[PDB]
Short mmCIF file of C-alpha atoms in Angstrom, two decimals:
data_model
loop_
_atom_site.label_atom_id
_atom_site.label_comp_id
_atom_site.label_asym_id
_atom_site.label_seq_id
_atom_site.Cartn_x
_atom_site.Cartn_y
_atom_site.Cartn_z
CA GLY A 252 109.06 109.97 106.21
CA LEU A 253 108.92 108.50 102.72
CA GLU A 254 105.97 106.12 102.98
CA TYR A 255 104.68 106.16 99.41
CA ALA A 256 106.12 108.44 96.75
CA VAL A 257 104.81 110.98 94.24
CA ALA A 258 106.25 110.83 90.73
CA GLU A 259 106.30 114.39 89.41
CA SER A 260 107.50 113.61 85.89
CA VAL A 261 109.75 111.42 83.74
CA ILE A 262 112.87 113.16 82.43
CA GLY A 263 115.23 110.35 81.45
CA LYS A 264 115.22 107.32 79.17
CA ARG A 265 117.63 104.42 78.64
CA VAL A 266 117.00 102.06 75.74
CA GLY A 267 119.05 98.89 75.90
CA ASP A 268 119.77 97.40 72.49
CA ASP A 269 121.69 94.36 73.72
CA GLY A 270 118.67 93.06 75.63
CA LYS A 271 118.62 95.61 78.42
CA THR A 272 115.20 96.72 79.65
CA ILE A 273 114.28 100.27 78.70
CA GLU A 274 114.42 102.31 81.89
CA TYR A 275 112.85 105.65 82.66
CA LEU A 276 114.26 108.17 85.08
CA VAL A 277 111.25 109.11 87.14
CA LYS A 278 111.62 112.41 88.92
CA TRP A 279 109.59 112.08 92.08
CA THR A 280 109.05 114.77 94.69
CA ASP A 281 111.44 112.38 96.41
CA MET A 282 113.80 113.23 93.51
CA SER A 283 116.81 113.29 95.83
CA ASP A 284 116.62 109.51 95.39
CA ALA A 285 115.29 109.59 91.80
CA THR A 286 115.32 106.09 90.37
CA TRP A 287 115.30 104.51 86.94
CA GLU A 288 112.12 102.47 86.81
CA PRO A 289 111.15 100.06 84.00
CA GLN A 290 108.30 101.18 81.69
CA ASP A 291 105.99 98.46 83.03
CA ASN A 292 106.25 100.02 86.50
CA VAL A 293 106.59 103.62 85.32
CA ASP A 294 103.41 105.69 85.32
CA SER A 295 102.37 105.61 81.67
CA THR A 296 100.56 108.91 82.00
CA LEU A 297 103.85 110.59 82.83
CA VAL A 298 105.61 108.50 80.18
CA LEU A 299 103.22 109.97 77.64
CA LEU A 300 104.58 113.36 78.64
CA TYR A 301 108.13 112.23 77.92
CA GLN A 302 107.22 110.40 74.72
CA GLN A 303 105.63 113.68 73.59
CA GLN A 304 108.92 115.43 74.42
CA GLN A 305 110.52 113.31 71.73
CA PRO A 306 110.90 114.88 68.27
CA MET A 307 108.71 112.36 66.51
CA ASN A 308 108.65 112.09 62.71
CA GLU A 309 111.35 114.48 61.54
#
């Protein structure tokens, strides 16, 4: 079934200004049930891939 899960990539980001935790949409191979996980729990290696997708220093 779905014992364990394999995060393929991170494709979404929600930054809460009013004190909401910044969530990341992790696209697993289980992506049918893709979930917004908090950075602390999100694989930082994949996060790096999304951070690098950001147009940094325009």
